[PDB]
Design a protein around this ligand. Structure first.
Ligand SMILES: [Cl-]
Ligand SMILES: [K+]
Ligand SMILES: [Zn+2]
Length: 440
């Protein structure tokens, strides 16, 4: 036998992403991890830090996205999001790319394919057996699950495909029933151009009973519209910020001004804009508060080189300094390829990213540290590096301990992808004999 750096070897497509979060959660000495496996089904494993033992992976549900007739080989939008409820049941939200006509008429958006789904463990703290609840709307993409101190559960998602509101559904009974969706970002026709307001959001815990949300704007062009008939692209710009007080129900901007829901583009431009990106095209990141309660934002942006996706985008750091939004500098200086990363912040000046980028054809995952509030970062330890590969990463694990902070997928082909749990220094290893016995 020997120890290997990966805990599973069956990921497909992009098995992880920062937007589907948490992908993993630490509780009581156990780190639970989830990722997208064969047929885009959600798989879950766990590591016991005291005994050194891995369990799983086990399949938690059956995704429609892996059973489509034709189309893109892998969809990836239904990779899993995890939550542990106050009774210890593990919930997995997965499978959705906006629903389809067979599910109904979507009253808050359009559709695409794949009903959004919700599985729960049959027993508390036991990842081996699952049951379906599917008690959330099927018209969902981009699940983000948050549990408050009182046990209430909020699931944030886009209520359909592009031309859809962003919503949450709230449960007060440990995820067994959910109230109807509440729209917090509005989609609607623009009156000045042939496009629809569309959004991408990342919701996370704030302090106290607050949830914080960073988001970018998608110019969702009608077919044949735009410059020289360019038509529909992934064009996105800018980054915005707002907060949700879950006790009162009210939303506000960084200065505490209250917002009427759902927030429109016009209100957002007036009240919640955090950093304009000019002509740069964006891909949203994440947001976290510093020790003074001030929001910091990771936003990816890059030059539009004429592709349907614009061009490669690099992570940049933005923060509220107490009086104004500042920043926008790239985390990796002078880097012009693709970078992604999540960050931790303590004092407002002290920010650390765990970021992936490529050097030549090698995939790198390394820590980058700033002590000047994100104007300059310096690379510190590399936690994982693989030749002839690229990495997909999760957001930081909920309540992570130093040994197990982020999930990484070593993309080489689009199947058989090795999955890694990494900490401050490197991977949490697994016995190869154990892994082979466990792999389904
Ligand atoms: Cl990119
Ligand atoms: K990502
Ligand atoms: Zn669109």
């Amino acid at each position: 036998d020997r120890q290997v750096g990966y805990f599973a070897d069956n990921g497909v497509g992009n098995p992880l992403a920062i937007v589907q979060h948490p992908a993993g959660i630490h509780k009581n000495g156990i780190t639970y991890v989830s990722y997208q496996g064969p047929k885009e089904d959600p798989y879950i494993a766990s590591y016991n830090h005291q005994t050194g033992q891995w369990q799983g992976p086990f399949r938690a549900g059956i995704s429609e996205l892996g059973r489509r007739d034709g189309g893109k080989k892998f969809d990836n939008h239904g990779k899993p999001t995890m939550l542990i409820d106050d009774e210890g049941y593990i919930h997995i939200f997965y499978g959705g790319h906006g629903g389809q006509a067979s599910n109904g008429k979507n009253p808050l958006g359009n559709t695409h394919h794949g009903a959004n789904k919700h599985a729960v463990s049959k027993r508390p703290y036991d990842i081996s057996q699952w049951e379906d609840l599917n008690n959330i709307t099927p018209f969902g993409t981009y699940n983000q699950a948050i549990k408050m101190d009182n046990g209430d559960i909020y699931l944030f998602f886009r209520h359909g495909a592009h031309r859809s509101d962003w919503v949450y559904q709230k449960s007060v009974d440990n995820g067994r029933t959910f109230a109807s969706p509440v729209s917090f970002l509005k989609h609607k026709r623009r009156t000045d151009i042939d496009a629809v307001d569309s959004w991408y959001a990342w919701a996370g815990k704030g302090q106290g009973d607050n949830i914080i949300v960073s988001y970018d704007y998608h110019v969702c062009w009608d077919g044949g519209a735009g410059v020289n008939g360019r038509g529909h692209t992934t064009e996105r710009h800018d980054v915005y910020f707002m907060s949700f007080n879950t006790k009162t129900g009210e939303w506000s901007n960084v200065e505490g001004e209250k917002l009427v829901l759902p927030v429109t583009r016009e209100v957002a431009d007036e009240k919640t804009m955090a950093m304009r990106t000019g002509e740069l095209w964006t891909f949203n990141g994440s947001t976290h508060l510093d020790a003074q309660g001030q929001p910091h934002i990771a936003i990816n942006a890059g030059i539009d080189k004429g592709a349907k996706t614009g061009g490669p985008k690099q992570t940049r750091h933005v923060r509220w300094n107490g009086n104004e939004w500042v920043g926008g500098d790239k985390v990796i200086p002078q880097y012009e390829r693709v970078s992604r990363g999540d960050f931790m912040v303590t004092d407002p000046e002290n920010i650390r990213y765990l970021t992936t980028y490529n050097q030549d054809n090698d995939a790198v995952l390394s820590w980058w540290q700033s002590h000047d509030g994100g104007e300059h970062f310096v690379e510190d330890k590399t936690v994982l590096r693989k030749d002839n590969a690229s990495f997909a990463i999760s957001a930081f694990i909920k309540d992570a301990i130093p040994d197990a902070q982020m999930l990484v997928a070593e993309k080489v082909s689009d199947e058989g992808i090795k999955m890694y749990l990494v900490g401050e220094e490197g991977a949490v290893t697994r016995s190869l004999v154990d892994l082979k016995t466990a792999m389904p």
